[PDB]
Design goal:
- Chain B: Keywords: Calcium, Membrane, Metal-binding, Transmembrane, Transmembrane helix.
- Chain B: GO terms for molecular function: metal ion binding.
- Chain A: It comes from Vibrio parahaemolyticus serotype O3:K6 (strain RIMD 2210633).
- The complex is a heterodimer of chains A (90) and B (126).
- In chain A, 33% of the residues lie in helices and 31% in strands.
- Chain A has two helices and five strands.
- A five-stranded mixed beta sheet of chain A has the order 1-2-3-4-5, with helices on one face.
- The longest helix of chain A has 17 residues.
- Chain A is globular, with a radius of gyration of 12 Å.
- Chain B has one helix and eight strands.
- In chain B, strands 1-2-3-4-5-6-7-8 form an eight-stranded antiparallel barrel.
- Chain B is mainly beta and 126 residues long.
- Helix content of chain B is 3%, strand content 66%.
- Chain B is globular and about 40 Å long.
- Classes of the chains: A alpha+beta (90), B mainly beta (126).
- At the A-B interface, β3, β4 and β5 of A face β1, β6, β7 and β8 of B.
- β5 of chain A pairs parallel with β1 of chain B, so a sheet runs across the interface.
């Protein structure tokens, strides 16, 4: 196996990444953002790699929303959080 | 006993307007599987090209949450008139492609699989 191990678990957030620093920053930002917009996911999985970023948003209705994002240079917690939160809320 | 899995996702290039809309459908009758994938490419929000990819082979369970697929057939249909590929056809028909489960349920499953050299996704069961 080579997939990044889990690195952050809150109420509904799961984050697989080899960068524990970016995971922490990203999780709290998601919790904050989704609560501010009063959005309650049944579960939210996220995966961080060198090039790609992917997540799965499992709704309270158990219908999921999956996304992938490849990027030249790495992004930080705010850019990823705004991207994820933007896709979820649509 | 056959277990069906289905899901969709959208790939987005951060350095371009290029993107995929991908619908995934898997059928597992025990030790073998049949995957059906439809990739609609959009550039500038315009249906550019499409791909229908059909797979077949063996799904081998290594550990309780660690699988891998061995394809014996891959079939690609595309538009006759002539980009990022989620996976290369040669890397599928030569290697074993790992799938690590991270959560199991009766309505859906969550896995980390080999598209884009690392992707996490949720599949609905039926």
């Amino acid at each position: 196996d080579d997939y990044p191990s889990l690195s952050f678990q809150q109420d509904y957030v799961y984050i697989f990444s080899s960068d524990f620093q970016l995971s922490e920053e990203l999780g709290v930002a998601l919790i904050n953002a989704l609560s501010a917009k009063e959005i309650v996911p049944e579960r939210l999985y996220v995966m961080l790699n060198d090039k790609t970023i992917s997540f799965s948003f499992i709704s309270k209705n158990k219908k999921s929303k999956n996304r992938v994002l490849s990027t030249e240079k790495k992004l930080n917690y705010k850019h990823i959080s705004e991207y994820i939160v933007n896709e979820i809320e649509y | 006993p056959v277990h069906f899995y289905e899901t969709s996702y959208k790939y987005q290039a951060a350095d371009s307007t290029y993107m995929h809309d991908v619908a995934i459908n898997v059928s597992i009758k025990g030790n073998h599987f049949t995957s059906d994938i439809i990739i609609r490419e959009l550039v500038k929000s315009e249906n550019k090209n499409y791909y229908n990819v059909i797979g077949h082979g063996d799904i081998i369970q290594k550990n309780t949450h660690q699988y891998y697929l061995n394809f014996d057939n891959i079939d690609v249909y595309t538009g006759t008139n002539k980009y990022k590929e989620p996976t290369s056809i040669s890397s599928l028909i030569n290697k074993s492609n790992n799938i690590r489960v991270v959560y199991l349920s009766e309505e859906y499953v969550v896995v980390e699989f080999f598209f884009y050299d690392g992707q996490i996704i949720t599949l609905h069961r039926y």
